[PDB]
Design an enzyme around this catalytic site. Structure first.
Site, PDB file in Angstrom:
ATOM      1  N   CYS A  29       0.817  -1.208   0.000  1.00 33.63           N
ATOM      2  CA  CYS A  29       0.000   0.000   0.000  1.00 33.63           C
ATOM      3  C   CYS A  29       0.855   1.264   0.000  1.00 33.63           C
ATOM      4  O   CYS A  29       0.465   2.276  -0.583  1.00 33.63           O
ATOM      5  CB  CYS A  29      -0.905   0.018   1.246  1.00 33.63           C
ATOM      6  SG  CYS A  29       0.010   0.058   2.809  1.00 33.63           S
ATOM      7  N   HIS A 197      -1.800   1.553   7.275  1.00 34.40           N
ATOM      8  CA  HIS A 197      -2.215   1.373   5.890  1.00 34.40           C
ATOM      9  C   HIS A 197      -2.129   2.694   5.140  1.00 34.40           C
ATOM     10  O   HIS A 197      -2.734   3.684   5.545  1.00 34.40           O
ATOM     11  CB  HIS A 197      -3.645   0.829   5.847  1.00 34.40           C
ATOM     12  CG  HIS A 197      -4.108   0.446   4.477  1.00 34.40           C
ATOM     13  ND1 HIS A 197      -3.414  -0.436   3.678  1.00 34.40           N
ATOM     14  CD2 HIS A 197      -5.203   0.814   3.771  1.00 34.40           C
ATOM     15  CE1 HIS A 197      -4.061  -0.596   2.538  1.00 34.40           C
ATOM     16  NE2 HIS A 197      -5.151   0.151   2.568  1.00 34.40           N
ATOM     17  N   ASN A 217      -8.801   3.593  -1.781  1.00 37.32           N
ATOM     18  CA  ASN A 217      -8.063   2.455  -1.243  1.00 37.32           C
ATOM     19  C   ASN A 217      -7.501   1.679  -2.432  1.00 37.32           C
ATOM     20  O   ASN A 217      -7.845   1.965  -3.582  1.00 37.32           O
ATOM     21  CB  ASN A 217      -9.000   1.561  -0.420  1.00 37.32           C
ATOM     22  CG  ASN A 217      -8.250   0.642   0.537  1.00 37.32           C
ATOM     23  OD1 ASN A 217      -7.022   0.554   0.504  1.00 37.32           O
ATOM     24  ND2 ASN A 217      -8.993  -0.050   1.392  1.00 37.32           N
TER      25      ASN A 217
HETATM   26  C1  76V Z   1       0.208  -1.218   4.075  1.00 34.65           C
HETATM   27  C2  76V Z   1      -0.677  -2.352   3.579  1.00 34.65           C
HETATM   28  O1  76V Z   1      -0.466  -2.851   2.465  1.00 34.65           O
HETATM   29  N1  76V Z   1      -1.661  -2.751   4.398  1.00 34.65           N
HETATM   30  C3  76V Z   1      -2.016  -4.194   4.590  1.00 34.65           C
HETATM   31  C4  76V Z   1      -3.038  -4.590   3.468  1.00 34.65           C
HETATM   32  O2  76V Z   1      -3.430  -3.770   2.632  1.00 34.65           O
HETATM   33  N2  76V Z   1      -3.457  -5.868   3.467  1.00 34.65           N
HETATM   34  C5  76V Z   1      -4.271  -6.452   2.369  1.00 34.65           C
HETATM   35  C6  76V Z   1      -5.722  -6.529   2.915  1.00 34.65           C
HETATM   36  O3  76V Z   1      -6.625  -7.021   2.032  1.00 34.65           O
HETATM   37  O4  76V Z   1      -6.035  -6.168   4.038  1.00 34.65           O
HETATM   38  C7  76V Z   1      -3.623  -7.844   1.955  1.00 34.65           C
HETATM   39  C8  76V Z   1      -4.395  -8.558   0.819  1.00 34.65           C
HETATM   40  C9  76V Z   1      -2.161  -7.695   1.436  1.00 34.65           C
HETATM   41  C10 76V Z   1      -1.137  -8.678   2.045  1.00 34.65           C
HETATM   42  C11 76V Z   1      -2.588  -4.390   6.055  1.00 34.65           C
HETATM   43  C12 76V Z   1      -1.535  -4.002   7.140  1.00 34.65           C
HETATM   44  C13 76V Z   1      -3.878  -3.550   6.352  1.00 34.65           C
HETATM   45  C14 76V Z   1      -5.106  -4.362   6.796  1.00 34.65           C
HETATM   46  O5  76V Z   1       1.784  -2.668   5.182  1.00 34.65           O
HETATM   47  C15 76V Z   1       1.699  -1.578   4.246  1.00 34.65           C
HETATM   48  C16 76V Z   1       2.547  -0.382   4.722  1.00 34.65           C
HETATM   49  O6  76V Z   1       3.588  -0.074   4.155  1.00 34.65           O
HETATM   50  O7  76V Z   1       1.985   0.268   5.823  1.00 34.65           O
HETATM   51  C17 76V Z   1       2.705   1.373   6.438  1.00 34.65           C
HETATM   52  C18 76V Z   1       1.982   2.672   6.105  1.00 34.65           C
END
Ligand code: 76V
Length: 251
Positions: A29, A197, A217
């Site tokens: 993200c 996130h 998102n």
């Molecule tokens: C930001 C991030 O990518 N967030 C995660 C996320 O998007 N998870 C996805 C989901 O569907 O929830 C799954 C499919 C991907 C593995 C999680 C933490 C949120 C629920 O770890 C990323 C980052 O760099 O955050 C710091 C700002």
């Protein structure tokens, strides 16, 4: 400043502002919020339209941006844009641009025709080459930013930045109740913490007397409100105003 503002309506000639991407089964993200806003700003401050490659950001930045699919640092992503630049690259299997996204789209906390997302996803290789058939070369396809900065945890300053320069990237703490968002203005009331996130903030407004931020998102269009969501504005709710970053493209 106006009571409401939607970058999608204010810059009709920049369709990337209306786009919603899918980060897939990978914690990228941080990279997505960045390349999305950068795509928007390149169009806003060059009126060319370019689908900035999430793949290039995700795989080639390295430690300066964190740990690929294991999470990263938004401000580090905008730095990469100014230091190494970013090539173009569209959606998975789109064959659009130098480096299209290589991780398949999936279902993020919703049911659908796509496979459900899995927590496990490895960071793809940093390949400094473009897909076959695409021109110019990887090096020649780089788009550089000429500034990378952080906007203060100040509602008015954040609104002014968006109003003048376009969408920015932000981050907030996700608790489980956010996962089921469908409509309205999100306010955290329950659920275990999921982690930070990063997202793209492209506007603001007021719904039923509740001030909010218009956010895109990266969990595809069947999640939330067509991929977007609204979250409480003005109270640094879940830290939504605490990590705003942006930058300007070179001219
Ligand atoms: C930001 C991030 O990518 N967030 C995660 C996320 O998007 N998870 C996805 C989901 O569907 O929830 C799954 C499919 C991907 C593995 C999680 C933490 C949120 C629920 O770890 C990323 C980052 O760099 O955050 C710091 C700002």
């Amino acid at each position: 400043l106006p009571e409401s503002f939607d970058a999608r309506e204010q810059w009709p000639n920049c369709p990337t502002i209306k786009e919603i991407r899918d980060q897939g089964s990978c914690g990228s993200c941080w990279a997505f919020g960045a390349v999305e806003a950068i795509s928007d700003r390149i169009c806003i401050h060059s009126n060319v339209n370019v689908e900035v490659s999430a793949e290039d950001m995700l795989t080639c930045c390295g430690g300066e941006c964190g740990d690929g699919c294991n999470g990263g640092f938004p401000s580090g992503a905008w730095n990469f844009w100014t230091k190494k630049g970013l090539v173009s690259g569209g959606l998975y299997n789109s064959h659009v641009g130098c480096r299209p996204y290589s991780i398949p789209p999936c279902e993020h906390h919703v049911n659908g025709s796509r496979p459900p997302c899995t927590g496990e996803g490895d960071t793809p290789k940093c390949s400094k080459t473009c897909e076959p058939g695409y021109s110019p070369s990887y090096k020649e396809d780089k788009h550089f930013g000429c500034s990378s900065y952080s906007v203060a945890n100040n509602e008015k300053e954040i609104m002014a930045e968006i109003y003048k320069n376009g969408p920015v990237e932000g981050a907030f703490s996700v608790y489980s109740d956010f996962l089921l968002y469908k409509s309205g203005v999100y306010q955290h009331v329950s659920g275990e913490i999921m982690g930070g996130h990063a997202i793209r903030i492209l506007g603001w407004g007021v719904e039923n007397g509740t001030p909010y931020w218009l956010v895109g998102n990266s969990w595809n269009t069947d999640w939330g409100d067509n991929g977007f969501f609204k979250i409480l504005r003005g109270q640094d709710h879940c830290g939504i105003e605490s990590e705003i970053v942006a930058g300007m493209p070179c001219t």
